[PDB]
Design a binder for this molecule. Structure first.
Ligand SMILES: NCc1cccc(CNc2ccc(C(N)=O)cn2)c1
Ligand SMILES: NCc1cccc(CNc2ccc(C(N)=O)cn2)c1
Lengths: 248, 248
């Protein structure tokens, strides 16, 4: 690898997936695509299909005890995982994306971002054999309490979220553990709705305090449990009380 | 549209995105790709870039009051939204994916799945002008408490999650509001780990009760707040108590 872009904190992400082409959505486009071109982020995919030996390249298998659904076939998946681990060498944490995993939040994203090397295992069908968790997986993580057709979209969501914390990928993420304040661009009037005059004022301290107050107000109204997680500053306590008094 | 596959509950999803090619990850592959080919799911994209008039096809704009980041330019985004709404005709709910949105969970996925027509607006940069929420957006939803480079991955996560509830897309999603039980496929022994003998027993009622007990045990150990959301059946109360007594 060569180039001029500072990449001390670069991340390597190994991916195990039956649909590696899905990952073009992050490696070919936008901020993540730029990260890849600039060697800040590398996404390398192994497909269990390439580790099959039967004529029809079988990658699913029947669950012991029956059921409607299939599981990922153990041998092709295990061989793909082992190949990824050999490529990564020492220090790679292996993650399985599952609804039974630890719930991802921004704090967890920043913990994951400390790893220089990750391997992300993408389950299809009803998922993977329990014993592969014990033998191959370091951590299970969920992107949220819902079921998807595969772990690819969860894996891409985690890649994108961690990529933002790689220095140089971006040009403020839930600033203060709070929801975003309202923001505005041109025009000054839209369908009779005006930009709050403080944002046109050029008064940097007044704008900062208005934005903080609005963030505290929105977080209180939409997600009050997020405020319970915080030890508010004196300034935040006062702006929230002002917002709550104005609301009432 | 023509074909033989039953599609009474088919869904149309309009998408507003600066990177419509990202959506190939769902429309070209796997279960979602099959849904699209069989006319169960249609994903139609409008790109704000196509609604620009300046020589350089500008789609970002500066925030009033300053800041580090840009917002989506209003005119191209609004025109794209209006074109999607005209294509959808009556009854289309407009969704903006944002961290300040309602938190998606499987119950919310099933509520969203009742809509025959959705429009999903994908924010890039720091997001979109507050007044477009009031004028264009019916509902805001978040896929989870983390920030991504754009609303594309959130949008694709919601499409995939709702697609599973379209009759015919699949061949059991958090069965019972509980985490998955352990499951197993070949071989019978893996790195000295055996398949629980009950799953080889062929006793359908014994297997059902073991799986339910294991689901209740895993949910209790990993996500005990999920049990507080439930009114357990008599059988579930007894299997949980058995699992908790065995654990202690
Ligand atoms: N039986 C459901 C199941 C169990 C493991 C893996 C998958 C694949 N699909 C996924 C994976 C993760 C997530 C998530 N919420 O992170 C959602 N869907 C499915
Ligand atoms: N300033 C952060 C911001 C606000 C709105 C929209 C985006 C775009 N990226 C997103 C959108 C949704 C989600 C989510 N959690 O659903 C995450 N990232 C960003």
């Amino acid at each position: 690898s060569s180039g001029l872009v500072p990449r001390g904190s670069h991340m390597w992400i190994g991916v195990i997936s039956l649909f590696p082409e899905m990952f073009k959505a992050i490696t070919e486009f936008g901020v993540t695509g730029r990260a890849v071109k600039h060697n800040l982020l590398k996404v390398e995919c192994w497909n269990p299909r390439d580790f099959t030996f039967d004529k029809h390249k079988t990658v699913d298998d029947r669950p012991y005890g029956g059921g409607p659904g299939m599981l990922m076939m153990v041998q092709p998946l295990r061989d793909a995982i082992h190949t990824a681990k050999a490529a990564a060498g020492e220090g790679a944490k292996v993650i399985y994306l599952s609804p039974q995993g630890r719930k991802l939040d921004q704090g967890g994203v920043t913990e994951l971002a400390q790893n220089q090397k990750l391997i992300l295992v993408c389950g299809r069908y009803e998922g993977i054999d329990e014993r592969l968790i014990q033998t191959e997986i370091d951590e299970e993580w969920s992107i949220g309490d819902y079921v998807l057709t595969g772990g690819e979209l969860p894996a891409m969501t985690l890649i994108d979220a961690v990529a933002r914390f790689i220095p140089g990928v971006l040009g403020d993420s839930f600033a203060d553990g709070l929801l975003d304040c309202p923001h505005y661009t041109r025009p000054e009037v839209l369908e009779g709705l005006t930009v709050p005059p403080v944002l046109m004022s050029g008064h940097h301290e007044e704008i900062r305090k208005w934005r903080l107050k609005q963030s505290l107000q929105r977080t209180w109204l939409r997600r009050p449990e997020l405020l319970e997680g915080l030890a508010l500053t004196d300034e935040q306590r006062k702006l929230l009380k002002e917002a709550q008094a104005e609301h009432n």
